Amino acid sequence: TYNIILAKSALELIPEEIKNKIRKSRVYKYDILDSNYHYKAMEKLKDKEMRGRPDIIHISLLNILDSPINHEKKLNIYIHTYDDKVLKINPETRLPRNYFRFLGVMEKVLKGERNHLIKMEEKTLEDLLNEINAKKIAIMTKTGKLTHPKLLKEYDTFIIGGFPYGKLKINKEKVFGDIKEISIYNKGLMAWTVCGIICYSLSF
Amino acid sequence: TYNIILAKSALELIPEEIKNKIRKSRVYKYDILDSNYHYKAMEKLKDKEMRGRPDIIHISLLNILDSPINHEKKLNIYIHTYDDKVLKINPETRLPRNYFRFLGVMEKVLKGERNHLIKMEEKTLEDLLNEINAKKIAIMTKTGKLTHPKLLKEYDTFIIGGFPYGKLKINKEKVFGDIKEISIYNKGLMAWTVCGIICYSLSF
Ligand SMILES: Nc1ncnc2c1ncn2[C@@H]1O[C@H](C[C@@H](N)CC[C@H](N)C(=O)O)[C@@H](O)[C@H]1O
Ligand SMILES: Nc1ncnc2c1ncn2[C@@H]1O[C@H](C[C@@H](N)CC[C@H](N)C(=O)O)[C@@H](O)[C@H]1O
């Protein structure tokens, strides 16, 4: 099996820090940080530029969950969040295609309510890698070594940034497995495209 | 330069027959049929089971538009709809990631408002195929002949149903080019997954 991880993902409950600046409305009734609705209240938020984009996770998961490699039960799926929660997504999860419905599911999971298909734990990215015994880790990034996807089969673990803008940073000395930075294209792609390219390279 | 077509797509202004059963609301203000909001009003609509799913198109287009093969300007992109409209999607279209905003864009286009990146014409699928001079056509369907994605490069035109349930029906006698039915996997996949698999085959 392969592990696929969307890491430092822009999927969080609204940070206490800024709840005071959030005026609630009926157009958006979720406690999930979303820049489309909280852009102002996020102005002085640390790393604001990489937070508040849950649709990156939604769209990527729609791609991952439906991929042949996942239908063949050959994937382990994890969402690691900006604030160090890890969601293990059961391969048979039926993810709502509706964005708001999606937010509703995630809101409950992140608040610790039980979900037999999506397990949540508090955990750093590095600890996750060690506990699943990731051995050869490909960190996907447009600034890594250009690499043909037919070579991706050589790694057992793939990490894709689940965030809008930035670069994925990981503490080498805290990870037992070997980490390699890998680009599969010379332009910046969206996260779900990268997830798709990985999944399909694993089947074909 | 390849043609990719999402065909008989579940993307329509509310059908004349059931307009009287559907009121704009604050929850969903768009004149686009969506069964997540209009399920009951669609009870007695013909082919209801393959209509009212704009999200299939939204997600597929997000995959297509961000694919390397499209960044390299090697795609022509078409949405053919259930009611015989054809939307030509400029490769540089920046499609809203937000579903409702996507609906707002598509609603205007379908109503005939000028959009310089998305052109709309009344047109059947067969007519579309003839106009673009499709010669070697792969119709994707799980029931077709299984074909490793590696071979997709031999065709010039790909057709994927932009609908939830059923099978694409095409009058071959009305089509100049050659049509083969092709399966890329031994299981029903979602349309966006098939689009993605095709797009990535074309680049690797
Ligand atoms: N050309 C690429 N090769 C490998 N991974 C990529 C590529 N483009 C985007 N990604 C992944 O997509 C994630 C989220 C992106 N919105 C950020 C892209 C950013 N330009 C980057 O390469 O880090 C990134 O953190 C990367 O992991
Ligand atoms: N295993 C598959 N191999 C090739 N194309 C597929 C496959 N599964 C779905 N598609 C395409 O995706 C479209 C949308 C589907 N939701 C329809 C599912 C239906 N089971 C079918 O294969 O036709 C279909 O019209 C096909 O064009």
Curated annotation (Swiss-Prot), chains A, B:
EC number(s)?
2.1.1.-
Q: What class of enzyme is it?
A: transferase
Task: Tell me the InterPro entries matching this sequence.
Answer: Alpha/beta_knot_MTases (IPR029028), Rbsml_bgen_MeTrfase_EMG1/NEP1 (IPR005304), Ribosome_NEP1_arc (IPR023503), tRNA_m1G_MTases_N (IPR029026)
* Amino acids binding S-adenosyl-L-methionine: 140-142, 161, 166, 184-189
Residues at site: Interaction with substrate rRNA?
53, 94, 97, 101
Q: Which residues are listed under the site Stabilizes Arg-54?
A: 55
Q: Which SUPFAM superfamilies match?
A: alpha/beta knot (SSF75217)
Q: Would you kindly state one Gene Ontology biological process term found in this protein's UniProt entry?
A: rRNA base methylation
Checking Pfam families in the record gives: EMG1 (PF03587)
* The protein, known as: Ribosomal RNA small subunit methyltransferase Nep1
Origin organism of this chain? Methanocaldococcus jannaschii (strain ATCC 43067 / DSM 2661 / JAL-1 / JCM 10045 / NBRC 100440) (Methanococcus jannaschii)
What gene is this protein translated from? nep1
